[PDB]
Amino acid sequence: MKIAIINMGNNVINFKTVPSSETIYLFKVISEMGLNVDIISLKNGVYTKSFDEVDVNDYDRLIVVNSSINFFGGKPNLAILSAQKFMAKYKSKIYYLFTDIRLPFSQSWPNVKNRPWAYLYTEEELLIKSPIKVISQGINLDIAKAAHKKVDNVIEFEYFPIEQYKIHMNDFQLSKPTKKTLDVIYGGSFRSGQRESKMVEFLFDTGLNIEFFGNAREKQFKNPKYPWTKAPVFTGKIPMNMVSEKNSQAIAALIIGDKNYNDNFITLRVWETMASDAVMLIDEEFDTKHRIINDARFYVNNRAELIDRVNELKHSDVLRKEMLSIQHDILNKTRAKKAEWQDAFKKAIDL
Numbered sequence: 496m497k498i499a500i501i502n503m504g505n506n507v508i509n510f511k512t513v514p515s516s517e518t519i520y521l522f523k524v525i526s527e528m529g530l531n532v533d534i535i536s537l538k539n540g541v542y543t544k545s546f547d548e549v550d551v552n553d554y555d556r557l558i559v560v561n562s563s564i565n566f567f568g569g570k571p572n573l574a575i576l577s578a579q580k581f582m583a584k585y586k587s588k589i590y591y592l593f594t595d596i597r598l599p600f601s602q603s604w605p606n607v608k609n610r611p612w613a614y615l616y617t618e619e620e621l622l623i624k625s626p627i628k629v630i631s632q633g634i635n636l637d638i639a640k641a642a643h644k645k646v647d648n649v650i651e652f653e654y655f656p657i658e659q660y661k662i663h664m665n666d667f668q669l670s671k672p673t674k675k676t677l678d679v680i681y682g683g684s685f686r687s688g689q690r691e692s693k694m695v696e697f698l699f700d701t702g703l704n705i706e707f708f709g710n711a712r713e714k715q716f717k718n719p720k721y722p723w724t725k726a727p728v729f730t731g732k733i734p735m736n737m738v739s740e741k742n743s744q745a746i747a748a749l750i751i752g753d754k755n756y757n758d759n760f761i762t763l764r765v766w767e768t769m770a771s772d773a774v775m776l777i778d779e780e781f782d783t784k785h786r787i788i789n790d791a792r793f794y795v796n797n798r799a800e801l802i803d804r805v806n807e808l809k810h811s812d813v814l815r816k817e818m819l820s821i822q823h824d825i826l827n828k829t830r831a832k833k834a835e836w837q838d839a840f841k842k843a844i845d846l
């Protein structure tokens with residue numbers, strides 16, 4: 496029994512980038528789960544084997560970490576191409592980890608045939624034929640099966656809270672009380688505008704001391720539909736494995752998602768925030784039934800309510816700690832199902 500995990504459109508090396516990080520974390524959870532795994536990437540490294548130094552069939556299971564198959568600019572991307580070649584020559588079922596609404600599996604050949612460097616590849620070389628099993632972290636598999644309507648070989652859809660791997664790591668631990676220097680914080684990319692409305696709403700013009708770390712930059716927010724005057728301070732990216740210490744820097748941390756994330760996906764930032772020293776403030780529309788935490792104080796419907804909830808936490812340290820204590824206790828309740836989670840994952844990949 497041997498398992499291989501690879502990223503479909505990103506090189507894997509260290510914790511500098513997010514796609515590389517989530518892949519190594521997945522590598523780690525599966526190993527700690529008592530399974531023999533290898534990460535296959537462009538070159539050999541601390542956590543990876545080289546695409547051209549291994550035989551895809553030495554493995555009995557192939558797990559693919561979703562990614563964008565877009566060749567930005569006029570250049571070939573080996574991360575995407577090499578990953579698809581690897582997959583293309585694999586005989587058995589491929590397990591596609593669908594963790595981002597906008598990254599469904601898809602043939603890369605259509606995007607290559609018309610490129611000018613198309614002569615370097617053949618259809619037979621990149622055309623992935625194996626049956627595809629899509630493991631979606633969305634409770635309602637129907638967002639996943641909708642994005643995968645155009646692709647044939649996809650014969651299966653199964654739910655599984657993939658991103659719970661942050662809390663099931665053996666080295667995981669809750670953030671400790673930390674000297675506050677921020678009112679609210681949020682870390683992530685611009686998501687190519689898919690979430691501008693929510694970001695402007697809860698992080699702009701609040702009158703509070705807010706920070707937006709991550710890849711997003713101020714100058715990207717210019718959609719006329721979502722005006723603003725005072726923007727939050729942008730501080731750039733940091734390693735994924737430093738995210739909880741960062742959130743812990745603020746009194747409260749924001750949880751928002753894409754439209755199709757709502758009442759479906761319980762993302763990674765939910766656990767990174769819930770486990771930090773920052774009170775978790777969820778956007779109502781993101782989890783209307785309150786599945787994350789059954790206490791309406793952790794939810795904010797709009798900008799005014801956020802400002803209000805925060806002014807409360809700023810006025811009462813007794814309240815801030817009471818809420819921290821509550822979310823931490825709830826997080827521990829999900830952790831106590833580690834065994835049940837690992838088993839569900841083993842079943843997902845037909846083990």
Ligand SMILES: O=c1ccn([C@@H]2O[C@H](COP(=O)(O)OP(=O)(O)O)[C@@H](O)[C@H]2O)c(=O)[nH]1
Nearest residue numbers: 513682683684708709732733734735763764
């Ligand atoms: O500087 C940063 C900001 C974010 N992240 C990671 O990227 C995720 C955010 O991803 P994205 O911006 O796509 O938001 P989502 O769509 O996951 O809500 C966070 O949860 C972290 O794991 C990171 O590693 N460094």
Ligand SMILES: [Mg+2]
Nearest residue numbers: 594595762763
């Ligand atoms: Mg994500």
